Design a protein around this ligand. Sequence first.
Ligand SMILES: [Ca+2]
Length: 769
Amino acid sequence: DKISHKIDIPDSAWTIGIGEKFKNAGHPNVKYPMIDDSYVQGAPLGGFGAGTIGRTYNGGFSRWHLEIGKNKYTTVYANQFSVFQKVEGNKDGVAQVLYAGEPENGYLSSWKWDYPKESGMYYALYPNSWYTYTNKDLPVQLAVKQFSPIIPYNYKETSYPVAVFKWTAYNPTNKNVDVSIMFTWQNMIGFFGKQVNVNSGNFNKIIKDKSKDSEIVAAVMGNISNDNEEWNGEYSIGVKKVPGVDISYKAKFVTTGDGSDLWHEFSKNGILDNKDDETPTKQDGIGSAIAVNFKLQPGQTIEVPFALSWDLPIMKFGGGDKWYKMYTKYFGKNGKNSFAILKEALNNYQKWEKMIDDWQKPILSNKSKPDWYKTALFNELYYLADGGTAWENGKVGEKRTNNMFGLLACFDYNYYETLDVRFYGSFPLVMLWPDIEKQVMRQFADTINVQDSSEFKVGSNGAMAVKKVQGMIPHDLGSSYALPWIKINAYDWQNPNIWKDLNSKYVLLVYRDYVLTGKTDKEFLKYTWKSVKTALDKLKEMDKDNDGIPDNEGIPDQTYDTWSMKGTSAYCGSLWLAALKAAQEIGKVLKDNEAYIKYNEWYKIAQQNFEKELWNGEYYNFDTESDHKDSIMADQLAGQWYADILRLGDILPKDHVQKALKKIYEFNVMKFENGKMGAVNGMRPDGIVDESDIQAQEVWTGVTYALASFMKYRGMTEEAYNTAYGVYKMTYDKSGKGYWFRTPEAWTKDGNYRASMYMRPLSIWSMEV
Ligand SMILES: [Ca+2]
């Protein structure tokens, strides 16, 4: 490996060998079918709301999130980078696809597949990833840096459906070597969203943009139809000319054939035919190829940028609504703009790299923090792009000031903006994209007084319940299979209109968003104030026994939606206390004296009774009425955790909080698989895991990262990082379960998982407050 010295990969990048087999991988531990796409994954490409493409560590473009809200795992074999090298003096050169695998059938059989093991590495520090190719049959060493311009406090480039592939080639040998790099791409119009004739009308064109000190050559892969539909648009691949490289292309090769139409050209001398051909296809799949060829002398390095764009302007959801994607603000809505997007990236990628470095530098340069923590902190952010992210720029046929946004809980539970989860998972948005965060919270504010009296069947018990009750915050803002933002509460396993955490979490999120953006946005507090008061007032009515605290009803009426709580719970009780204190403070800011007095009065009574009912001398009991009410819950003081972040002070005595956190570390962490796997949710005071429900026996990744942040703020530094380390280890390490770029909600002691690709572990960013 002589190429690593020519590029700048951070030491905290996650690494794996190209073609590496992983032996230890976990699988779903539930009864019904659940997504398991394997450990062959990578950092995604694509902006927020753009649709994303997962290119794996083996080199394949395999995890397709271009249909917004859906996860489709299948390698499109035509989509590759390939290399040709010939040493000066030799008769023949060698050509190789940079993919550690091969197609299942006979398509593209002429290409040289099966990139060999121990010949290259993949590296990732989101939004960047890299591949190095250090192969004993490739005298010139190559590396690529690939990324999309995901930039905090930037809502423009962050939206773009584009990726840059910045190649570096170096000759360490004593002979001249001819080198070509080729990007191939299938015309994927019709890959989704087209019910019949999936390739029909697809056609490819070549664009040559020549103007003083820029030459770009690109393929635009589109359809002859000018229809405005989810399926129609364009893909583009291309390259910018640099001194010492020549560009060649092939506009049309058949992907549903042996591929020798292209490969016979590339494999001979690394130079393509430059054959333009706009003939549309009928049944056959088609693709394009863009290549560069250059000669490297001994000791010479060259850099060359390629790019990929996709202009698929319309997202359709299963309920029938069609929306424009956010990036259409910047490039237009007609779906004929892929070249414009590509060109912007090829002309500005160096600026974007510097913008990414500028935001990553404060953390990366802090030598007090271990590299493993940096690996997790950056790579967990993959989910902001990969979580079915929807970001609208108008309904098709519709103009508004704001652009609605939604992130899925996950793909197995296909619900946008699950509020009980976003309480944990929205930290990166408030910290790094706060205009999105506040928009999402205004979306929730707008739903508070929505009433939908139609009934639905509750999954857990078969009973009928009202869809949406006035004054109750919704569980979610809909499903990609139905109508995001329009039909809320798509979730039906429990009835969220009786949940005891949603209304409090909503208030806490509101105040959080004010505090973490500088305590200046009075207008945001003004917008949300009626909903906050309504939310707390409704929750107060659920106090059955007049102790000033809502009563859990002996069912799973909160985020642990199979783990029953009864009476006063530490979890919902502490959240309530903190929400009351937040509402007091909002009341002061907005000069709503009567609200300040009321919520102050409620807070004092509830605080007194919470402490009396639950404090046992060592920790706070799980609740007051359940069978295992004396279980030690990892999340028992979630309200105090948020109170620390919101600078609301002590809602419970400092000494008792410290005792409880030490107990959690001692039991839920250290007595669960030697503290190497996070914090198990429920442990009995005898040090055996609570078996009353599956959720008690799970580590929740987002709960554990949040608990680490709580420990850290409370000065328990070693405990904090040791607790978080188990989550990092399970997710990224060779000794873990292979969950990189698909961090799940939960795992059990065997390491097997529930619900990969989950929002909650974005809570790691609470460790940076
Ligand atoms: Ca009560």
